[PDB]
Write a protein that binds this ligand. Structure first.
Ligand code: HEM
Ligand code: HEM
Ligand code: HEM
Ligand code: HEM
Lengths: 146, 141, 141, 146
């Protein structure tokens, strides 16, 4: 993560006005709905029969709530995304076995949730900035696969 | 494959886009070139600065090639049959780039239609662009 | 899409495989589980040790599901229509895994048919498994 | 790259009996043929109209010859694939702009060439070993994309 001062501000300014509670479940939710196979990891959450059931399952808005944390966390430790995610990398890999290609799917659905919640404020340059961050994050968790 | 429920959401969401189609078609391109720098190696003779009337003009091509799909959805492999040779045969556009675009195209729609960009239509749109991407790459298969 | 020249290489290469089909169908699986550890999260009730008669038995399913494709190539979306629901609906097999397999399946054939694994047939085979993979994932589109 | 002693031997024993000259062009060649779009980077090589023209173009068996080098090189520096490829990473990224997803395609077509040239000697465990190496290499070149 380089984040030039221009980008550094775009990511901070925006990220600061983010509904850290709701936005977190908004992503996880749409992931299970748009990429069905992913529900294969949250069968202990409940009814994921329809999108309405997924967009309401309390187990989901509680997990997405914890996911968003790791971000605010990594976002406050760009200079080292590897160290911060060491723990979660061992968890998602040698225990959950999620494929690293699915960390990119989640980082993008997130970018779509931010684009939806901030509409126009979410300018192209603001995206190209977050895309870098998401990417940097998707590479830390995938780190333990070596 | 696309289901009747999907068809309805694509035709629904595209309708609500209407008039701005071309506009939107050039906002996805800029987002791409910016977020995915590597995709510019295709538009040298192009000006990729914020105002390029070349990017605006192209956004109309893409936008109407898509509107050409939503209206003939049950038959894309024939309507798009032509854009299949150009992207695969003449241009040699790497298949990954069709993914990078489609993404920016969903990140554009959500920033313009915060009402109907429901988790469902979102999924319907992603399947639709997934089918378009498949057809334009088909000439490789 | 697959061309007559492709059809010929698939039908050609598969013919020369014949009798060993099932054998080969279980060598690709082991290669996968080994090279791509993450793909085992689907076969718990399975024994994945070198001799598993469960892996051998499954390799026959895959092998004959493929032989079912080469013979009905012009029509896979219907013949395989069924294996489409099972992999997409019931199983929820991630689309990436269809790529990991197809690879091991080409790394198997080359290690058994060093004569006809020409750059061309290689390309023809890759397109064929590319079309099979697409059809089994289609139920997502 | 971990390479346990078992794997370390499999990769060495095999790699030692490799026709370092011919094998190198065998891969590059089949890449342009099986993944056509990639020819978009070697238009200065000549006739790539048919596979026969590609599997003979001298420009190709000379470039593939240099590619294989970097491998024998990285293969002799597993403990650090990042440092060794620093140069080539800047080249393929901020100059050639090849997408990192195409370094995986080449590493695999290579595994197929080795599977073809050593047939049965190329056991599954020998593959699962090389696959790790290829992967480790495909991540170094892709490194400069951050
Ligand atoms: C952007 C990358 C991701 C982040 C930031 C992330 C973060 C987390 C965190 C913080 C936890 C729980 C930690 C705790 O409970 O203390 C977790 C658990 C888990 N993650 Fe991820 N994750 C990511 C992507 C994914 C993806 C793509 C999947 C695949 C479906 C996934 C599947 C899981 C599962 C199944 C659990 C639940 C484990 C449990 O029941 O505790 N994660 N993740
Ligand atoms: C959703 C998928 C896409 C659609 C619907 C689409 C549609 C089109 C259409 C209709 C044309 C213009 C025909 C003309 O005006 O003569 C075109 C041309 C072209 N497209 Fe796309 N395209 C898409 C994705 C891509 C991608 C992913 C790339 C590259 C990253 C690409 C590269 C090009 C190039 C190089 C041209 C020629 C433009 C020029 O150089 O003047 N296209 N596309
Ligand atoms: C080339 C593509 C593939 C073909 C042709 C294929 C074909 C088949 C066939 C014919 C069946 C067995 C039906 C039966 O005996 O009742 C089956 C079942 C199954 N396949 Fe595949 N398959 C392929 C790829 C995959 C992949 C990539 C995975 C996972 C990584 C997968 C996971 C499964 C599972 C879980 C079953 C059920 C087996 C069991 O648990 O008993 N398949 N497949
Ligand atoms: C496994 C990863 C790869 C390795 C080991 C590798 C290695 C190399 C090396 C050593 C050079 C030339 C260095 C010199 O001339 O001194 C080079 C140049 C180049 N590579 Fe790669 N490369 C890889 C993958 C790719 C891929 C996937 C493409 C995409 C088509 C590619 C495209 C290029 C191009 C176009 C050049 C030629 C530049 C010239 O004309 O000098 N490379 N590569």
């Amino acid at each position: 993560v380089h984040l030039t001062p221009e980008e550094k501000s775009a990511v901070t300014a925006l990220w600061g006005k983010v509904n850290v509670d709701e936005v977190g479940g908004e992503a996880l939710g749409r992931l299970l709905v748009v990429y069905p196979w992913t529900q294969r990891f949250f069968e202990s959450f409940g009814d994921l029969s329809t999108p309405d059931a997924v967009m309401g399952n309390p187990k989901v808005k509680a997990h997405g709530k914890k996911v968003l944390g790791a971000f605010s966390d990594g976002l406050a430790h760009l200079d080292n995304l590897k160290g911060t995610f060491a723990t979660l990398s061992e968890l998602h890999c040698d225990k959950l076995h999620v494929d690293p290609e699915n960390f990119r799917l989640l980082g993008n659905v997130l970018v779509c949730v931010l684009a939806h919640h901030f509409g126009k404020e979410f300018t192209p340059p603001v995206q190209a900035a977050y895309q870098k961050v998401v990417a940097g994050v998707a590479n830390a968790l995938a780190h333990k696969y070596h | 494959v696309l289901s009747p429920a999907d068809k309805t959401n694509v035709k629904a969401a595209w309708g609500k886009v209407g008039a701005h189609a071309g506009e939107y078609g050039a906002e996805a391109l800029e987002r791409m070139f910016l977020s995915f720098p590597t995709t510019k190696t295709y538009f040298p003779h192009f000006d990729l600065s914020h105002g390029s009337a070349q990017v605006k003009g192209h956004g109309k091509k893409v936008a109407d090639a898509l509107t050409n799909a939503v209206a003939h959805v049950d038959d894309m492999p024939n309507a798009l049959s032509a854009l299949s040779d150009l992207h695969a045969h003449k241009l040699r556009v790497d298949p990954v780039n069709f993914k990078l675009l489609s993404h920016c195209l969903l990140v554009t729609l959500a920033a313009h239609l915060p009402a109907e960009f429901t988790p469902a239509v979102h999924a319907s749109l992603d399947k639709f662009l997934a089918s378009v991407s498949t057809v334009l790459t088909s000439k490789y298969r």
